[PDB]
Ligand binder design. Structure first.
Ligand SMILES: [Mg+2]
Lengths: 1337, 603
RNA sequence: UCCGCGGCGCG
DNA sequence: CTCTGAATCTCTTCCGACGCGCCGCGGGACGTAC
DNA sequence: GTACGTCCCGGAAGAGATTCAGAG
């Protein structure tokens, strides 16, 4: 079962594993992120309305005035997209908000407000999303990349080893809020608790606890358990629990009930513990020396004297024991403090602190926060209540609260945005337990601790910044308010929010420039995960663990695609099936398996809960019932790989394609290739160039259809129907009967995009691929874009290739190309350049653009009109003039005597645009921008008349076609219920309203048709008026410029020795020499080969997949030429039908199972004709074809089975003694031309700071001689050349003038002098107080 | 500098000067009215902070800032670092009369000359063209010269050809590493838009042809030309400045061709004949009547220099191969015949070239070098060594070896479930058994690939060395080693995880067959680790090289003989096993300190 | 206008 | 108990490769009159 | 709206504070 346009060219596919979930909407991240920010979200959640409800409601300083929020609405954009990129204005829309201001009277704060006022006010402008998912800021399209940042919540790092150089690992626990000040705890070699705030100086931990209204006894009770001592009449009896004696050191004989249990000098045994549990011993006698190390917790005060006997947290002594015993105390409570079970960290920290008063703690905090300021109670209280417990400055997000709760094993996963005392005390307790040895540390690289942002979140954050700025502004303005004498628009201003949004969208580390020259390039650019940006890492502070891939990266982020160089592993790309969870984590699909049956329903798993379960591999065979054919299947439980039983798994992979990203998944035979060359080949594939005539790729992956459809490049059909009128400019579709709306059905109209400037100086064009009378179905390709063909993705071309070393012209990686390749004109690429001329305003008068130019003759003016603008179609080369632009420098200072002196022997001067030297081409379009109030020349009038004619003819044709279809629909409806074959159309269709007929659904349907006809004609008149007014008016430009002339050159670039060509496996190389056709080797059949590679690279660069690809291409052409031979003779359809059927079965159990008995004879004839150029073959990434299928398919053809064919030589003409390999490989052209890096300079401009030549190519400069270059020259005996080169040719001015004069005279002699850059250093170092000078000669 | 618009892009120094002078003027004004001490002290402290900021910004806390956040620069910042004068504008400065492009091969050139594109040829040498044109008197002024050079008539190309005949130029690679990073050639005009560079030089530059860019320079004055002609040719750099081995060693292709040249097979057409001299061996070979490599007895007349500077002519009948005679056609007179009787790999040819240089002089060495390069390309092209997909024969015992290893690991695991073994020792044991299986399968694959060929020898049967394309390409020494062929044919062994330990499951699939997903995923770890390491290591090495080079800048040899008697005792190193380096490669090229005494003491 | 900052890319 | 006093711990600075090619933004604000 | 005045991450190394070790 296939649709009609899939019947044009069916792609044979291998494979055995049946897929269950097709590729989703591949461009979903940007769209589903942005369809939350500009949406009217009811009741408020993660949107603009939430931001307003968060910041907007404001109450003045008891001024009885309040500014609340009501609603918002976005108006229609002023300009469409096309006008936006053609002019230069942002594709934005106004943001209307309804605001309420209330002012109350006296004596009551809570009652009903006396007076209100409501109105609509304007504020800011928001950039929109085009349907391609991209942004237009300033005449330049730009793309936003999603950012990967550090997840909010509590985390336990460890800092292995490095600190203190002693092997004692420390432990820190930092809390990273979503917005606010940080907070972290850590240890010391002294084993103390320390608090730090925003990396400032170290403070003890107990200060916060004391400031939170906790007494010392409360702290000790919370952080430690309790033990009781009871002073009986003899030896201070003690209450005992047997389970606490694990690992404690004994000091005497433990006995109970008059029975000895533990021997003096020995330690407890497990059997002794069992015995103690058997006897339920509770109270034991204790010697006085056993209490020689316990510390009191709470204070004891004498009732009689009224003093303090023992203070909190100090060790007791014998004298203190006697005092407390004689004071009448019976219950004595102290600490546990074992060596291994519970460290006395809290006790020693409370000992080491200098202060023990909450007001003192607040004083310490206040002085720490703001040094050098007298503290006071109110300021400290406010500051502490505002740092952590204020809604304005500290706020955890819902994700932050969820993770914070999860890491502490609480129950309710919902809470407020601020923290509380329970949270901090639980964090301290968890840290103590982690130090104690229970629990485990948490690593960072795990994807369960990382979060992805997108456009919406960052836009909301910047917008909130703008609103907080305007909020403090309106507060300070309302603090001096008045009784509604002003209307609520003065306080609100469009400066701050607009400035913030413009700076974010224009100048940010994540609003990066679009790099588009291929559909794949944009399919892989918008799906990018950058680890840089605000709030993220920096390039120079990235270690190795952040670059290496964690074993939890399987199926979420690509492991093999990343830009090589300074930043590897930070620009990783998202996978194919991967999505975004609601909170923001990454997840991938899976299949839930029952005990024996693999159910087809899909479950989503995040990056945390997957480790608990066990996951089987995708590439495991299975039966029709889902039972695993083996009793053991390899799986992964916790980052490992092992073997498990028949029934212990709970989830299954969806398909074998989910491990890679879209960038590298297009490389056939990937599983036979090394990772390095796969990465390189993906990088070259990302950076191809459009070709003049695309050709289908012979060996594909069966995925090109999705990547071609989902990119914003192909005009995919919206609603099904049949084509009615096709043209190189527009396409019209007649709608089918089952897909019409009840009203205003009509027919669809499209508009192709012709030759226009691209963004990377390439050319994007659209050619219609649909015939006439060909019906179409919904969601189908009609006209292909650049590097596309019939809905497939065709980057380069396929050519016959052969492997051998040939006379050294393919020495190490060079390639030789026969003249046949350029003969067929199949590597020509089109490049479009934009040249601008500005008409600024300077002193002494403005400049003139007329053609009146002196110092040149008819040779330089034959290509110009009267206005001074080149005609359209004038073949221009290097050395002509495009616009005659002259600057009147002036200062003529005419004199009756001295001026005629200049004319005795033998003002405004030219500043016209100059063609780049070396590039030919033809001008295609000239566009002019003029400031309003300036006289337009003749050419501007003609151009605007041309636009008016084009617009009016377009609208007229649109009305003509639309109403023709409308009246055809009227006729079709009228065919039933009172039809008049000829009586209806005696007089033209303009009057079909006075028709006498019965009133039914048809009659009022026609009435509705006429009503919408009238409405349409009115609306078309209105918008024709609006459009002509819009196009006739002038346009705003930059300040100070008079007019702008835009001219487009269109150079056609051929192939030439120096260009870079590369395959799809990383075997790049630059072509070396072009050869006549006779010289390349030819086979016995007679056909010559086209490209000869270098076989030497295969051992080292172990990319064995290229050989397999070559053999597969040979097989494809072996089928294709056989079809060609069968087609050239006018043979009947049965033989070709059976041949194609045999070609399609040709293998083991596959998923295609196509049949030809359901094809029309015309359809199969067209399929055969379109298949004459070879058979495309689809191969999955990790489910490809083995060797046996290749051998069998070659056996289907007459080609040799071994894959090596004997070959002859062209020069000498004898057989090679060893046969070689030939076949068809997909060869690409990269965007590194040779006429872009070639450069030379004799003597150009000089800089001003130091008289040295400039740098770069656009600036006419020369190359740089570095310091290592100087060392290399010094390593020889080189003396004169070094001095000469860095003295005369570079710095000295008199020296180089003298050298020039001498060279033009035929002598060669040098005067060194002294370089002036050293003189610059002299002056600069003299600019300080240092006395630098040069002594005698 | 005024830019496009009504605003002026002010420099940081100007703003700092304005601030300091404004504060000074305000303080001068304030003291006139005898202000209270507090305010004048406060403004003085402001002035002092400002002048410190101007003199050195960022040394004190709260560094001043400019437009939005970037700290403004100062003179101290203008001297330091890569953005300062010393290391960016004084030691290395941009020079005119230069150009750059991409490189191609053009293997038909001789090694003392290089190609150069026409456009750069016209653009670089414009002053010379002007001088010659004025001497020949085709222009009264310079403006006519301007029109003629910009119009490039037919009268200027002959002049350009005349001025280039003997004018050396310099080539350069951007990340220059050693003293061979700069060399001079004799340019030869060529069409196109790229520079052709001789392939044999390409080994010295460590430059492939994947888009490398070379920068050209012109020595202008007369002494520069003479110095470049005396020291800067490739002909005067035949030995490395780091070691005594030649640096013009054949790299990749010619070595492969020559290794194909000499490997006699037991049976080929044309066996058992006698030839007069090498000059007719080619006559037989090119007529198709004798195979390229076959046993044959020929007469060879080599010249040897046992006598005092004169060459001795001796003749004999040597048993050799036809290809060896064809190569004997190209050897100079000095070398004895016993040097081309072996397989003639890469080390052998390097040593042979070295001894040719050591014995015969200099000029015959360079002539032999470029001639051998020509003939190597020619015969490698004739051979046509192509890699095929059936050329990788998998050993048939691999499956049974894997089965045995899996049975052993299964029984070890079962013993682990018996509670008799710990974790670390079984870990080490399974690693050991996997290593044993790896080396065993590697040995089996090497054994059944390197000598699989068997021939009837015109008799019953005989076993000879194999002519497999991949084995021949890997054993020559052109590119590859045992590790790469082992990885490509046998199982790849044990990969490591970022923790540094070894994953318990080896990869039991070679590149010829398929790979499972996790097997690829594990190797991704090593690939990424290697790429990151090679990214950072070059950055470290550059800084280390600069630190070494700055300190030894001033040591220049100035005297011919100090005249001392103190030396260091030199002995070969013995680590505790076989000798690593003998006296031959450690004492060579040094002067004796004390007289060497034979164990015939007092001799 | 020749400079600075930022991003991307190739050796 | 007291004085050195050598040893130790902690705070502050400098340093991290070298050639290119493409593109985009940049004295801005804040008030004072004109 | 605009011209104009004022303004604004290790790693290595050393210097300095601490410390406690031990002799007098
Ligand atoms: Mg390279």
């Amino acid at each position: 079962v296939y649709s009609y346009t899939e019947k044009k060219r069916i792609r044979k596919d291998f494979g055995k594993r049946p897929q269950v979930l097709d590729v989703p909407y591949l461009l979903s991240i940007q769209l589903d992120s942005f369809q939350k920010f500009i949406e009217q979200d009811p009741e408020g959640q993660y949107g603009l309305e939430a931001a307003f409800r968060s910041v907007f409601p404001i109450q003045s300083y008891s001024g009885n005035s309040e500014l609340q929020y009501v609603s918002y609405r976005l108006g229609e954009p002023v300009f469409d997209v096309q006008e936006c990129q053609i002019r230069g204005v942002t594709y934005s829309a106004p943001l209307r908000v309804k605001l309420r201001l209330v002012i109350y009277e006296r004596e009551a704060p809570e009652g009903t407000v006396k007076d209100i006022k409501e109105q609509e006010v304007y504020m800011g402008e928001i950039p929109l999303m085009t349907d391609n998912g991209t942004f237009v800021i300033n005449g330049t399209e730009r793309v936003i990349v999603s950012q990967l940042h550090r997840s909010p919540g509590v985390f336990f790092d460890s800092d292995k080893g490095k600190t203190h150089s002693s092997g004692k690992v420390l432990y820190n626990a930092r809390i990273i809020p979503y917005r606010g000040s940080w907070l972290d705890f850590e240890f010391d070699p002294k084993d103390n608790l320390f608090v730090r705030i925003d990396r400032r100086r170290k403070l003890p931990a107990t200060i916060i606890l004391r400031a939170l209204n906790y007494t010392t006894e409360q702290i000790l009770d919370l952080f430690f358990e309790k033990v009781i001592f009871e002073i009986r009449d003899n030896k201070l009896q003690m209450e005992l629990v047997p389970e606490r004696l694990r690992g404690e050191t004994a000091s005497f004989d433990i006995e109970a009930n008059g029975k000895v249990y533990v021997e003096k000098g020995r330690r407890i045994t497990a059997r002794h513990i069992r015995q103690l549990e058997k006897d339920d011993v509770k109270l034991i006698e204790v010697p006085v020396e056993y209490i020689a190390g316990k510390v009191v917790a709470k204070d004891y005060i004498d009732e009689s004297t009224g003093e303090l006997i023992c203070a909190a947290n100090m060790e007791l002594s014998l004298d203190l024991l006697a005092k407390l015993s004689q004071s009448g105390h019976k219950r004595i409570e102290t600490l546990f403090t074992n060596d291994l079970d519970h460290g006395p960290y809290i006790s020693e920290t409370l000992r080491v602190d200098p202060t023990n008063d909450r007001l003192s703690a607040l004083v310490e905090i206040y002085r720490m926060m703001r040094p050098g300021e007298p503290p006071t109670r109110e300021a400290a209280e406010s500051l502490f209540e505002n740092l952590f417990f204020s809604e304005d400055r500290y706020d955890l997000s819902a994700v932050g609260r969820m993770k914070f709760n999860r890491s502490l094993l609480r129950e309710e996963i919902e809470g407020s945005g601020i923290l509380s005392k329970d949270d901090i005390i639980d964090v301290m307790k968890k840290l103590i337990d982690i130090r104690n040895g229970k629990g485990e540390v948490d690593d960072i690289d795990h994807l369960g601790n990382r979060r992805i942002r997108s456009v919406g979140e960052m836009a909301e954050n910047q917008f909130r910044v703008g609103l907080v700025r305007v909020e403090r502004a309106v507060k300070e303005r309302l603090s001096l308010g008045d009784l509604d004498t002003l209307m609520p628009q003065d306080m609100i201003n469009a400066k701050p929010i607009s400035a913030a949004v413009k700076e974010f969208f224009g100048s940010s580390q994540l609003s990066q420039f679009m790099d588009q020259n291929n559909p794949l390039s944009e399919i892989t650019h918008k799906r990018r995960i950058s680890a840089l940006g605000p709030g993220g890492l920096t390039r120079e502070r990235a270690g190795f663990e952040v670059r290496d891939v964690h074993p939890t990266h399987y199926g979420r982020v690509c492991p093999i695609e990343t830009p090589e160089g300074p930043n590897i592993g930070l620009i990783n790309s998202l996978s194919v099936y991967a999505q975004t969870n609601e909170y923001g984590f990454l997840e991938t699909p899976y299949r839930k398996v029952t005990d024996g049956v693999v159910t087809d329903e899909i479950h989503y798993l995040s990056a945390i809960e997957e480790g608990n379960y066990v996951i089987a591999q995708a590439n495991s065979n299975l039966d029709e019932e889902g039972h695993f054919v083996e009793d053991l299947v390899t799986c992964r439980s916790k980052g490992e790989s092992s073997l498990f039983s028949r029934d212990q798994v709970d989830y299954m992979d969806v398909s074998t394609q989910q491990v890679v990203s879209v960038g590298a998944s297009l490389i056939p035979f990937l599983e036979h290739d090394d990772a390095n060359r796969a990465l390189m080949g993906a990088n070259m594939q990302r950076q191809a160039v459009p070709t003049l005539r695309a050709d289908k790729p012979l060996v594909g992956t069966g995925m090109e259809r999705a990547v071609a459809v989902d990119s914003g490049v192909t005009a995919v059909a919206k609603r099904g129907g049949v084509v009615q009128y096709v043209d190189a400019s527009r396409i019209v579709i007649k709608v089918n009967e089952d897909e019409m709306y009840p009203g205003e059905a009509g027919i669809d109209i499209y508009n192709l995009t012709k030759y226009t400037r691209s963004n990377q100086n390439t050319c994007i064009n659209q050619m219609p691929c649909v015939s006439l009378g060909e019906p179409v179905e919904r969601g189908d390709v009609l006209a292909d874009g650049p590097s596309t063909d019939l809905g497939e993705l065709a980057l380069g071309q396929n050519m016959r290739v052969a492997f051998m070393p040939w006379n050294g012209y393919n020495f190490e990686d060079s390639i030789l190309v026969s003249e046949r390749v350029v003969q067929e004109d199949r590597f020509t690429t089109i490049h479009i350049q934009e040249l601008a001329c500005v008409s600024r305003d300077t002193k002494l008068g403005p400049e003139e653009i007329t053609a009146d130019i002196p110092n040149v003759g008819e040779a330089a003016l034959s290509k110009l009109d009267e206005s001074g603008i080149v005609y359209i179609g004038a073949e221009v080369t290097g050395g002509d003039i495009l616009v005659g632009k002259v600057t009147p420098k002036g200062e003529t200072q005419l004199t009756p005597e001295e001026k005629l002196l200049r004319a005795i022997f033998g003002d405004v001067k030219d500043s016209s645009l100059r063609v780049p030297n070396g590039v030919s081409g033809t001008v295609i379009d000239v566009q002019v921008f003029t400031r309003d109030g300036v006289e337009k020349d003749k050419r501007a009038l003609e151009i605007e008349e041309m636009q008016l004619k084009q617009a009016k003819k377009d609208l007229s044709e649109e009305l003509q076609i639309l109403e023709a279809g409308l009246f055809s629909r009227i006729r079709a409806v009228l065919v039933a219920g009172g039809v008049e074959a000829e009586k209806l159309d005696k007089l033209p269709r303009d009057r079909w309203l006075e028709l006498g007929l019965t009133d039914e659904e048809k009659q009022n349907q026609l009435e509705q048709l006429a009503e919408q006809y009238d409405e349409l004609k009115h609306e078309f008149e209105k918008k024709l008026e609006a459009k002509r007014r819009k196009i006739t008016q002038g346009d705003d430009l930059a300040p100070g410029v008079l007019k702008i002339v835009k001219v487009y050159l269109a150079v056609k670039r051929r192939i030439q020795p120096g260009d870079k060509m590369a395959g799809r496996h990383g075997n790049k190389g630059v072509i070396s020499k072009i050869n006549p056709i006779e010289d390349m080797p030819y086979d016995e059949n007679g056909t010559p080969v086209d490209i000869v590679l270098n076989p030497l690279g295969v051992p080292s660069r172990m990319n064995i997949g290229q050989i397999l690809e070559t053999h597969l291409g040979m097989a494809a052409k072996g089928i294709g030429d056989k079809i060609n031979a069968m087609l050239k003779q006018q043979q009947e359809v049965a033989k070709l039908r059976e041949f194609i059927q045999r070609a399609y079965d040709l293998g083991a159990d596959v998923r295609q199972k196509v049949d030809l008995s359901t094809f029309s004879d015309e359809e199969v004839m067209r399929l055969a004709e379109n298949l004459r150029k070879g058979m495309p073959i689809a191969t999955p990434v990790f489910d490809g074809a083995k060797e046996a299928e290749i051998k069998e398919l070659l056996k289907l053809g007459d080609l040799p089975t071994s894959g090596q064919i004997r070959l002859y030589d062209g020069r000498t003409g004898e057989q090679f003694e060893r046969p070689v390999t030939v076949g068809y490989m997909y060869m690409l052209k990269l965007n590194h031309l040779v006429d872009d890096k070639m450069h030379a300079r004799s003597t150009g401009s000089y800089s001003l700071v130091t008289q040295q030549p400039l740098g770069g190519k656009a600036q006419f400069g020369g190359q740089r001689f570095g310091e290592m270059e100087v060392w290399a020259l010094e390593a020889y005996g080189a003396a004169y050349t070094l001095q000469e080169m860095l003295t005369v040719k570079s710095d000295d001015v008199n020296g180089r003038t003298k050298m020039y004069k001498n060279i033009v005279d035929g002598n060669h002699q040098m005067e060194p002098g002294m370089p002036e850059s050293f003189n610059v250093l002299l002056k600069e170092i003299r600019s300080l107080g240092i006395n630098i000078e040069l002594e005698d000669e | 500098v005024p830019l496009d618009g009504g605003r002026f892009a002010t420099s940081d120094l100007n703003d700092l000067y304005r601030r300091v002078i404004n504060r000074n003027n305000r303080l001068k004004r304030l003291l006139d009215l005898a202000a209270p001490d507090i305010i004048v002290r406060n403004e003085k402290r402001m002035l002092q902070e400002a002048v410190d900021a101007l003199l050195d910004n960022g040394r004190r806390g709260r560094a001043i800032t400019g437009s939005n956040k970037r700290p403004l620069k100062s003179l101290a910042d203008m001297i330091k670092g890569k953005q300062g004068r010393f290391r960016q504008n004084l030691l290395g400065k941009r020079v005119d009369y230069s150009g750059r492009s991409v490189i191609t091969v053009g293997p038909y050139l001789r090694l003392h000359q290089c190609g150069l594109p026409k456009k750069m040829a016209l653009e670089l040498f414009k002053p010379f063209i002007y001088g010659k044109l004025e001497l020949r008197g085709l222009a009264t002024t310079i403006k006519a010269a301007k029109k003629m050079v910009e119009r490039e008539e037919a009268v200027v190309w002959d002049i350009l050809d005349e001025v280039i005949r003997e004018h050396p130029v310099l080539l350069n690679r951007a990340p220059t590493l050693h003293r061979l990073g700069i060399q001079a050639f004799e340019p030869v005009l060529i069409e196109g838009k790229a520079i052709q560079l001789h392939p044999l030089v390409c080994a010295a530059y460590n430059a492939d042809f994947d888009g490398d860019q070379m920068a050209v320079h012109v020595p202008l004055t007369l002494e520069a030309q003479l110095e470049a002609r005396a020291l800067m040719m490739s002909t005067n750099n035949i030995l490395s400045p780091a070691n005594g081995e030649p640096i013009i060693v054949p790299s990749q292709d010619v070595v492969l061709g020559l290794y194909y040249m000499t490997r006699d097979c037991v049976n080929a057409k044309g066996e058992g004949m006698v030839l007069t001299g090498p000059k007719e061996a080619e006559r037989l070979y090119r007529s198709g009547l004798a195979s390229l490599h076959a046993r044959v007895k020929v007469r060879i007349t080599e010249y040897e220099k046992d006598a005092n500077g004169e060459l001795v002519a001796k003749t004999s009948l040597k048993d050799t191969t036809v290809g060896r005679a064809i190569l004997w056609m190209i050897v100079p007179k000095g070398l004895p015949y016993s040097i081309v009787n072996q397989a003639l790999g890469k080390k052998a040819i390097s040593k042979m070239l070295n001894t040719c240089y050591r014995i015969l002089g200099l000029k015959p060495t360079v002539i032999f070098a470029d001639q051998i390069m020509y003939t190597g390309f020619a015969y490698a092209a004739r051979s046509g060594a192509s890699v095929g997909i059936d050329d990788m024969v998998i050993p048939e015992k691999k499956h049974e070896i894997i089965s045995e290893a899996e049975a052993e690991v299964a029984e070890i695991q079962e013993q682990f479930q018996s509670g008799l073994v710990t974790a670390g020792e079984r870990y080490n044991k399974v690693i050991d058994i996997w290593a044993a299986a790896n080396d065993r399968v590697s040995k089996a694959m090497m054994d059944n690939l390197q000598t699989e060929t068997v021939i009837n020898r015109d008799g019953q049967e005989e076993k000879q060395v194999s002519f497999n394309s991949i084995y021949m390409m890997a054993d020559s020494g052109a590119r590859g080693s045992a590790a790469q062929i082992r990885q490509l044919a046998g199982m790849r062994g044990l990969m490591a995880k970022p923790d540094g330990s070894i994953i318990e499951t080896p990869i039991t699939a070679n590149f010829r067959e398929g790979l499972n997903v996790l097997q690829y995923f594990i190797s991704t770890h090593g690939a990424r680790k290697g790429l990151a390491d090679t990214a950072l290591k070059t950055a470290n090495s550059g800084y280390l090289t600069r630190r070494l080079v700055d300190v030894a800048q001033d040591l220049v040899v100035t005297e011919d003989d100090c005249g001392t008697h103190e030396g260091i005792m030199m002995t070969p190193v013995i680590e505790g096993g076989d000798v690593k380096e003998p006296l031959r490669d450690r004492v060579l090229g040094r002067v004796t300190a004390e007289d060497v005494l034979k164990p015939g003491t007092a001799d």
